[PDB]
Amino acid sequence: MLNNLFDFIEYIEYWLIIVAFVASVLIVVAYLTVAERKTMGYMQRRLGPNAVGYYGVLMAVADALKLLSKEIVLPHNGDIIYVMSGPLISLFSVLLSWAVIPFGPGLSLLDSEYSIIYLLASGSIGVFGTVIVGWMSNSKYTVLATVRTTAQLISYELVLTTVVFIIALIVSSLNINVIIESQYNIWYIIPFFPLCLIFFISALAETARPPFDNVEAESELVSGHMTELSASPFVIFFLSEYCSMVLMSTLTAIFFFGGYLPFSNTIHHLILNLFDQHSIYYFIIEGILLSGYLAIKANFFMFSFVWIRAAAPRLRYDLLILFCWYVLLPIVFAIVVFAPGILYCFDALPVII
Template identity: 50%
Template sequence: MLYSPLIMSILEVLIYTVSMLLIVAFVTVAERKTMASMQRRLGPNIIGYYGLLQAFADALKLLLKEYISPTQANIFLFFLGPVVTLIFSLLGYSVIPYGPGLAISDFNLGILYLLAVSSLSTYGILLAGWSANSKYAFLGSLRSTAQLISYELILSSAILLVVLLTGSLSLTVNVEVQRAVWFILPLLPIFIIFFIGSIAETNRAPFDLAEAESELVSGFMTEHAAVIFVFFFLAEYASIVLICILISILFLGGYLFSPLNSFIISVIHLFSF
């Protein structure tokens, strides 16, 4: 009985992490289908119904792929970089409130915690690019780091304006304050700036210069392959989902007006009578 709180905490983290990884997997499929539609292609449509299981096929291929590392690379830092980036990308989800009390850790400095964690993930990119002992990977890591730091200042400034309205660094308080009106209405210019900065922060087109596709390389991930490439891949899309959730919390009322929350409130009111 003494270990039951510890076991419950471990189960919560496991369920949370697996759910996030599944969401990230299907986001990759959604992006590939969207890009295919824009380019008048079919996209993934073989594995599973309408190609929905394509992400699992890609993950299996990368897990079974033979790993090749540069002979002159710093192997320890070469492996540590992707792990650091993935860990700090997933740590940001621990303070996200999906409903009243539905968060792993709902403390008063949630916004400050998110800013700190997102900043630390930059070190993984630097380590990966430098330790590969490749000029393409090193230049890619410098480009990516410069872009992340530059647009992070824009995101931080926009978030500070929201904090001035709420008077709190808590994400839950930020959501509850928007019961009267969403912040996107009084802060529409700030929302547009934040949205553009979010696209740059997640390396989406047209801000995907860090990958240097014109040079036919993958930026800081040029020398990475197989399993450790999966870490970078998951970290990138986990950051995309996290920034989308953050936009919803800061400007679109968060969980207040979600269909699931409305259904739960309706059921509670029904049984209260």
């Protein structure tokens, strides 16, 4: 057979694309954990993991497989609901939030003019997943990291939501693809540099990364909510924190560094002229290039997640809630009344072309 097998592929083709998409995200997340220790290792004059697989390539494999084969500790044998439900919400939200990220023009699973709302809505479901982990527990350390966890995520959600809305206001579109294409002539890091610092600061808090680390602070509250997590509930929750790191690093690339747009249009043009547009080999190269530009921009921020962790001491929680309210929020509302003013003054109010 050859004719009754081709249509089989055409009936399964769009499932292979999704698996290639999910594998694409998980490979980045899996090797983000290694890159965090490999990078933070070399800034501390260490080496980091280089013994598990040649040069430590199989380090995420060992850590995941080690925990996937640990004894799950349930309060009573049939309490799998309590342990898993917390991390499961967190993992689904951040895996569903990947559905709007485009790897090129139009290459996103969900394309709709409400992509920005879908992205902020999905993240807020993950916030609900985080606080549930401790709220079903009697351990004092685990239940400690709910009231402080709840407000930290609540407080820096306003700042992250408003920043996204200012960029959406400059293009007058809540579509991810339109925002990226709107940055052809200029990258929004040049006009809105302060928002990028505010976006990156807020992004750290939302993922509970240091220096906004007070939730899962080893010296303060041990593993935080994870001091009661082991085996699979630990990995799923740990994976969620690194899906968010990859996502929020990609989102900073999209909103301020042009997304998949090339660093040089000339180099992009010269490279693609070596392939014929009438053969599928041209489109693989463009897709590799366009995701390559995003990957390099995204990698720089996954680097900065680790880089700031190796350079800044952890910030005290009481001084952390007052930072986003008494410093960041007035600035963010000041700009949201500033950008419409400048645009109107020069008759440059945006329209979705």
